[PDB]
Ligand binder design. Structure first.
Ligand SMILES: Cc1nn(Cc2c(C)noc2C)c(=O)s1
Ligand SMILES: [Zn+2]
Ligand SMILES: [Zn+2]
Ligand SMILES: [Zn+2]
Length: 459
């Protein structure tokens, strides 16, 4: 039960229009052979070109939707579409390139996958809604063999160069022409009734069908994402570290502690309603406040309707005190709220494009987040940056430049000059805050929040 067996049956019904007379009885072994690839009984880490749904989910960062549409098939030119929005035309002799021979097309394919994937994954997973041409065209840009390492580094090889007879990862593949040991999955094998557009449109209104190959490639990967992350949710799956994951998570924990501590000091709420993650711990352990928890797992489909989290008859009165929605995405927040809401629009190596405007945020775990909506925050306002500290002004134990700032809410700044300790802690906190903002997170607070109320907590 490790990899997908090559002797597993492959349903060929979706392939019989491009490939008439295709055998109904088909294995991955016979299919790979029909595609022009010789697996040669090789026990060298690449057991099958196709992968399981579980293997695909573990490698979601590698997904590239791929679709080939016949323009006019060895006689006709093909249109190669990718979920990157790229459309290449291969002559056999929404970016739309004119017809070019395969030897130049393959070079472009390696450039595009390398630039899209080098900071995401150690491989490519071509996500298909297989009809024939995409599988028969792979011999023109894909080479297979034993698992290899990069000529310039220790990462696995994902490319091959016929010109130099060498292999490279996605980072050292400049000038490489072949895709080496790609992975693939046919979404049609999961059992669907009807075509791609009818299944995709059941869950997504953001990707139209402009009737080009890349449009289908986009709808394919989107449908795959909905099936694997929207309706099916697995938070036990671990994902490798590819960037600032640890810093972003540390920063988010510092910002939450800071923002919640200050709201409780400024407005002295008697009760706080913590709506979100059922495993949450009090972010401000020493706060006076009555801390009440409400369990609500991350919503991956649509944002929670505030009515279904609060009503149908807990303090019951969420209107008493303040409500904390730390990454708990709701359709419209109540006015007495402290809110952290991930902005799905953010461009990043952690944030992958998702379904219905949403995004797949992959940081240790994969969280499909519903589309960001500015109207969720109409009863709230954007939370401004501030650093608050009631700790003593004491250095203990990095060269200094005097800190001058209106947002350093400390006793030293109240009394005129900011001390070295609060200046180091202010700069560190501003860094953590900037990290979290640029990671996509947005902070919102109740309209009456005013940091001016924090100065009298020093006397
Ligand atoms: C990461 C990945 N980026 N893309 C391209 C893309 C972008 C950009 N916005 O929507 C899609 C779809 C993939 O297909 S995988
Ligand atoms: Zn390399
Ligand atoms: Zn879609
Ligand atoms: Zn100080």
């Amino acid at each position: 039960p490790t990899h997908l067996s090559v002797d597993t049956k492959f349903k060929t019904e979706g392939l019989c229009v491009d490939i008439p007379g295709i055998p109904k009885d088909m294995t991955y072994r016979r299919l790979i052979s029909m595609m022009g690839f010789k697996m040669n009984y090789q026990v060298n880490g690449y057991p099958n070109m196709f992968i399981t749904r579980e293997e695909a989910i573990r490698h979601v960062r590698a997904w590239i939707g791929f679709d080939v549409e016949g323009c006019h098939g060895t006689n006709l030119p093909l249109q190669l579409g990718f979920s990157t929005g790229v459309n290449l035309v291969a002559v056999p002799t929404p970016l739309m390139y004119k017809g070019l021979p395969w030897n130049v097309v393959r070079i472009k394919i390696v450039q595009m996958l390398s630039d899209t994937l080098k900071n995401l994954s150690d491989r490519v997973v071509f996500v298909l809604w297989a009809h024939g041409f995409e599988l028969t065209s792979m011999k023109y840009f894909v080479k297979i063999g034993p698992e290899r390492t990069c000529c310039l580094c220790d990462r696995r090889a994902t490319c091959f160069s016929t010109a130099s007879d060498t292999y490279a990862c996605w980072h050292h593949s400049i000038g490489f022409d072949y895709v080496y040991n790609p992975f693939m999955i046919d979404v049609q094998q999961w059992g669907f009734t009807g075509n791609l557009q009818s299944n995709h449109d059941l869950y997504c209104q953001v990707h139209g069908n402009a009737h080009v190959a890349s449009c289908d490639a986009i709808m394919t990967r989107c449908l795959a994402v909905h099936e694997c992350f929207v309706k099916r949710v697995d938070w036990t799956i671990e994902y490798p570290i590819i960037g600032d994951e640890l810093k972003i998570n540390a920063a988010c924990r510092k910002v939450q502690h800071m923002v919640v501590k200050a709201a409780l000091l400024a407005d002295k709420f008697p009760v706080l309603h913590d709506i979100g993650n059922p495993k949450a711990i009090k972010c401000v352990p020493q706060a006076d406040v009555e801390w009440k928890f409400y369990d609500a797992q991350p919503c991956s489909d649509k944002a929670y309707k505030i009515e279904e989290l609060f009503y149908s008859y807990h303090s019951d009165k969420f209107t008493d005190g303040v409500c904390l929605f730390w990454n708990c995405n709701v359709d419209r927040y109540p006015a007495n709220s402290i809110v952290c809401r991930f902005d799905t629009r953010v461009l990043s190596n952690l944030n992958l494009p998702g379904c219905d405007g949403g995004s797949l945020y992959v940081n240790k775990h994969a969280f499909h987040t519903p589309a960001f909506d500015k109207s969720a925050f109409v009863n709230l306002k954007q939370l401004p940056f501030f650093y608050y500290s009631d700790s003593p002004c004491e250095s203990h134990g990095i060269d200094y430049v005097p800190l001058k700032s209106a947002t350093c809410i400390t006793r030293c700044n109240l009394g005129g000059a900011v001390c070295r300790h609060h200046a180091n802690e202010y700069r560190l906190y501003l860094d953590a805050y900037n990290m979290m903002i640029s990671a996509g997170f947005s902070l919102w607070v109740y309209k009456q929040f005013d940091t001016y109320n924090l100065w009298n907590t020093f006397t």
